[PDB]
Amino acid sequence: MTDVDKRKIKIILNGEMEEAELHMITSPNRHCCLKIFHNNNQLAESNDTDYFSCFADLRNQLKNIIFLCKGAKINVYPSAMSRDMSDGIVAYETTLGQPGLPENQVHIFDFEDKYVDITPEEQRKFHSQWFESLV
């Protein structure tokens, strides 16, 4: 069995905010495929083991695009459990010195315009700083 979900997001390209379509193809054995379209044109595709990883691979391919999504925010990251159980669709919005709480959970493709003009590496490095701030 293969599941297919779809989701519209906003992206910034050349200073022009435009609407994109995401297709999420979840196939057997934790294969997640993320496709992104604009007006029926496929802009990119990434394949990975969860959708947060897929999203990061997607933003790395399209470095000229700002993705107005929680999943791109510098301080959003999944837990091991949210990555594992929700295929990375659910993640946490973290704050330095505070552990992640249920009320901090977000959908990685919900809208966000703040702190999203950053690379996947900057996001991942903030997450290590957050993790180390809990002691």
Partner: protein
């Protein structure tokens, strides 16, 4: 020593009762699993002892219907106990399962629709009850 833990998933029980839960990679480092279980791919499956903590994940944030799976195993590591105050998401009450969960050890599945309401009966794994 055997414990009951729970796991949410949108994947159907036919697929899960057959294939169990597999891990992403060989890393048996529990601290690195908690920091980021994709880098390196960790050798643990996440479960929880609190069934209510599966609902959000099983429904992909209230967007989809899904299932809460119930398991019985004896090799899990209590993440809050192992990490203590460094535990990054201690409210999840996570039990990490080294090596994964065999299909045989998944006892049943309970449906949950998108608004978080679960069915009032548990579907049995035929691998154990069929």
């Amino acid at each position: 020593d055997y414990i009951i833990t729970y796991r949410g998933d949108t994947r159907s029980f036919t697929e899960i009762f057959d294939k169990g839960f597999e891990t992403l990679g060989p890393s048996k480092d529990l601290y690195k699993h908690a920091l980021d279980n994709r880098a390196p791919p960790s050798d643990f499956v996440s479960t929880t002892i609190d069934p209510t903590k599966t609902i959000s994940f099983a429904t992909k944030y209230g967007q989809k219907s899904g299932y809460m799976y119930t398991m019985k195993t004896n090799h899990g590591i209590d993440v809050n106990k192992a990490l203590g105050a460094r535990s990054p998401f201690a409210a999840e009450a996570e039990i990490a399962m080294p090596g994964g969960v065999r299909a045989e050890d998944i006892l049943g599945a309970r449906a949950v629709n998108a608004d978080g309401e679960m069915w009032d009966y548990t579907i049995l794994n035929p691998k154990r009850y069929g």
